[PDB]
Write an enzyme that holds these catalytic residues in place. Structure first.
Site, PDB file in Angstrom:
ATOM      1  CG  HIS A 149      -1.812   0.942   1.479  1.00 48.22           C
ATOM      2  ND1 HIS A 149      -3.124   1.304   1.398  1.00 48.22           N
ATOM      3  CD2 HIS A 149      -1.768   2.290   1.582  1.00 48.22           C
ATOM      4  CE1 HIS A 149      -3.384   2.722   1.469  1.00 48.22           C
ATOM      5  NE2 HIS A 149      -2.688   3.362   1.942  1.00 48.22           N
ATOM      6  CD  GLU A 205      -3.084  -9.991   2.206  1.00 45.28           C
ATOM      7  OE1 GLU A 205      -2.642  -8.798   2.483  1.00 45.28           O
ATOM      8  OE2 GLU A 205      -3.530 -11.012   3.166  1.00 45.28           O
ATOM      9  CG  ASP A 261      -6.262 -10.802   3.380  1.00 46.78           C
ATOM     10  OD1 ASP A 261      -6.981  -9.967   3.600  1.00 46.78           O
ATOM     11  OD2 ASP A 261      -6.058 -11.584   4.473  1.00 46.78           O
ATOM     12  CB  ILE A 308      -9.693  -8.186  18.162  1.00 48.24           C
ATOM     13  CG1 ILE A 308      -9.685  -7.557  19.212  1.00 48.24           C
ATOM     14  CG2 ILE A 308     -10.608  -8.987  17.436  1.00 48.24           C
ATOM     15  CD1 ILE A 308     -10.276  -6.702  19.493  1.00 48.24           C
ATOM     16  CG  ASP A 353      -9.192  10.223   6.132  1.00 54.71           C
ATOM     17  OD1 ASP A 353      -7.690  10.169   6.831  1.00 54.71           O
ATOM     18  OD2 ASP A 353     -10.074   9.390   5.588  1.00 54.71           O
TER      19      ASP A 353
END
Ligand SMILES: NC(=[NH2+])NCCC[C@@H](N)C(=O)O
Ligand SMILES: [Ca+2]
Ligand SMILES: [Ca+2]
Ligand SMILES: [Ca+2]
Ligand SMILES: [Ca+2]
Ligand SMILES: [Zn+2]
Length: 316
Positions: free
Chosen positions: A142, A177, A185, A197, A226
């Protein structure tokens, strides 16, 4: 530095062993001479000065806890370089084999990673929200995709153009990925987000709404947070890209999937030939339609699916 190319071994953030390309001259440095004009990884030593010091190691073995973020930043930069070279015939982020520089251990408890216009920068996380961010191949790719964008379309980092910029980084982070083919995924950051988590991620491309991000233009964020929602409205484009690749029905609009490889070809061509610094979502649709037309023909399924996908997310 000047030296001879060597191969070290280490463990990454997730405890996996991998070989890394190093350079020997008194010390062994995280300097990979096998890719372009080099991949160089630096220690920021918990400070915010950049880049810090080129990573030096006495024995070419990188198994210390402190080494792990550097191993992964260095290795995953190499994978990302390989993806762009082998899949898109692009030599580093500038197309001319520019050296790739990354710094790890940036600041203290820093829950972010970024491309700063010159290099990659990775925090270690606070151990609760994130572990060291270079542990995520999608995160590394990214970041580095932002460098590709900077040298090509030049999408300004605000409002719709900034949301496209972010989505392009999520798309290619995900395609890298898949290229590496380790637990791939359509989620972003799952390998480093929230160690306490299981099964979550920072963002989802297949269902952006699972984390509250919009999946339709009618649901776009219109305020100023943002940078005008660049990590929020990216969900609209991420969903369209997911639909182009995988297909599906979304808000009652059916999309025939054409697969990841063709998604990558279409979006790479859009990014490098048609998008501009101020492109909006409607202009991205036009760029993707034109790119698919160039690659596959105006009457192709690929063109039809691009149109379906943008229709499904409400972008005309
Ligand atoms: N709760 C959660 N896992 N993610 C929320 C943030 C998603 C996206 N707007 C962002 O990356 O800012
Ligand atoms: Ca060592
Ligand atoms: Ca994964
Ligand atoms: Ca992922
Ligand atoms: Ca988690
Ligand atoms: Zn980003």
């Amino acid at each position: 530095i000047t030296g001879t190319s060597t191969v070290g071994v280490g463990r990454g953030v997730l405890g996996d062993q991998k070989n890394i390309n190093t350079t020997y001259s008194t010390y062994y440095y995280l300097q990979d001479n096998t890719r372009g004009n080099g991949i160089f990884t630096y220690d920021a030593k918990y400070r915010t000065t950049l880049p810090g010091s080129l990573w030096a190691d006495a024995d070419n073995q990188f198994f210390a806890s402190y080494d792990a973020p550097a191993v992964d930043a260095h290795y995953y930069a190499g994978v990302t370089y390989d993806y762009y070279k082998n899949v898109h015939n692009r030599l580093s982020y500038d197309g001319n084999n520019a050296a790739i520089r990354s710094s790890v251990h940036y600041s203290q408890g820093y829950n972010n990673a970024f491309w700063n216009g010159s290099q990659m920068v990775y925090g270690d996380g606070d151990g609760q929200t994130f572990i060291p961010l270079s542990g995520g191949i999608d995160v590394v790719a990214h970041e580095l995709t932002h460098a590709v964008t900077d040298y090509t379309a030049g999408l300004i980092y605000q409002n719709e153009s900034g949301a496209i910029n972010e989505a392009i980084s999520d798309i290619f982070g995900t395609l890298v990925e898949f290229y590496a083919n380790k637990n791939p995924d359509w989620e972003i950051g799952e390998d480093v987000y929230t160690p306490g988590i299981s099964g979550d991620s920072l963002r989802s491309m297949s269902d952006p709404a699972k984390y509250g991000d919009p999946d339709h233009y009618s649901k776009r964020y219109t305020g100023t947070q943002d940078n005008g929602g660049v990590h929020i409205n990216s969900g609209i484009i991420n969903k369209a890209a997911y639909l182009i690749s995988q297909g599906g029905t979304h808000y009652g609009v059916s999309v025939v999937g054409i697969g990841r490889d063709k998604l990558g070809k279409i979006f790479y061509r859009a990014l490098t030939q048609y998008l501009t610094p101020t492109s909006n979502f409607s202009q991205l649709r036009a760029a993707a339609v034109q790119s698919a037309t160039d690659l596959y023909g105006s009457t192709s399924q690929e063109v039809a699916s691009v149109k379906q996908a943008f229709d499904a997310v409400g972008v005309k």
